[PDB]
Amino acid sequence: SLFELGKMILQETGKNPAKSYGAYGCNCGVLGRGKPKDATDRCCYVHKCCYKKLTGCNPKKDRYSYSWKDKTIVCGENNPCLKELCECDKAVAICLRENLGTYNKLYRYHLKPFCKKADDC
Amino acid sequence: SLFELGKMILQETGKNPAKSYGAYGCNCGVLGRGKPKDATDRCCYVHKCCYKKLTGCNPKKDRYSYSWKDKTIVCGENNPCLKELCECDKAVAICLRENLGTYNKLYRYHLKPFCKKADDC
Ligand SMILES: *CC(=O)c1ccc(Br)cc1
Ligand SMILES: *CC(=O)c1ccc(Br)cc1
Numbered sequence: 707s708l709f710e711l712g713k714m715i716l717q718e719t720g721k722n723p724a725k726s727y728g729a730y731g732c733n734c735g736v737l738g739r740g741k742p743k744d745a746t747d748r749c750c751y752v753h754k755c756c757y758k759k760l761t762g763c764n765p766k767k768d769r770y771s772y773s774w775k776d777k778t779i780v781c782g783e784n785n786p787c788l789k790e791l792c793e794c795d796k797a798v799a800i801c802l803r804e805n806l807g808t809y810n811k812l813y814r815y816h817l818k819p820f821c822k823k824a825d826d827c
Numbered sequence: 828s829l830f831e832l833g834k835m836i837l838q839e840t841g842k843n844p845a846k847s848y849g850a851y852g853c854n855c856g857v858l859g860r861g862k863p864k865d866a867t868d869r870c871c872y873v874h875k876c877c878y879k880k881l882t883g884c885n886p887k888k889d890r891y892s893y894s895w896k897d898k899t900i901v902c903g904e905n906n907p908c909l910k911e912l913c914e915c916d917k918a919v920a921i922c923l924r925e926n927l928g929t930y931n932k933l934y935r936y937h938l939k940p941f942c943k944k945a946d947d948c
Contacts (some may be wrong), residue, residue: 709858725936728856736830736857736887757944
């Protein structure tokens with residue numbers, strides 16, 4: 707669930723999840739994928755693509771268990787789907803953290819029209 | 828879908844859908860419901876409850892058609908679910924507008940933890 711995601715992002719990035727990635731670029735958004743505007747956006751594209759390859763759980767409403775160990779997001783799941791799902795969020799939270807350096811606030815609330823149709827996952 | 832919804836909110840509120848309601852309170856967000864922080868937030872709350880009532884379509888992904896006749900959102904869909912959904916979105920856009928007077932920007936990007944568990948719809 708985006709609950710975990712929100713928590714992860716907040717734990718990694720330390721940034722307000724929605725304020726910074728609730729609507730960023732063409733992929734860090736509620737609706738759809740767009741060809742990435744920058745590294746931060748690519749994270750969400752990858753993440754959204756990560757969700758796509760999922761089968762067996764709802765990437766939005768399926769809560770999974772993970773924990774903060776040695777300041778590391780540790781997925782506490784064996785269910786292949788949740789495990790992966792959790793790994794999707796972790797990878798995105800991390801990625802997002804790793805790309806704060808190039809995070810551009812201009813890409814916030816970036817209108818979907820300025821987005822090109824993203825490649826296929 | 829969020830597309831129509833957004834559009835409606837724009838049409839009614841005149842405010843940028845994502846900026847003002849993509850993350851406001853405990854309900855105007857991608858998460859679930861939480862005790863509403865104010866009127867605006869209560870709108871979305873109602874609206875999410877509204878979605879729960881839907882069976883036959885996905886409120887998030889499923890797009891639909893509605894007209895904007897005489898500055899009024901006219902749900903054109905004939906399909907029950909989509910019609911219902913549209914009406915749900917119409918109601919929130921309307922409600923949001925009606926409560927624009929007490930819209931408090933300090934609720935934007937409100938953290939979910941800091942959200943009272945919402946009573947079941
Ligand atoms: C999957 C992903 O990266 C993402 C980012 C932001 C929002 Br809002 C939803 C999903
Ligand atoms: C149902 C509703 O009001 C709502 C508001 C904002 C977002 Br993002 C999703 C849903």
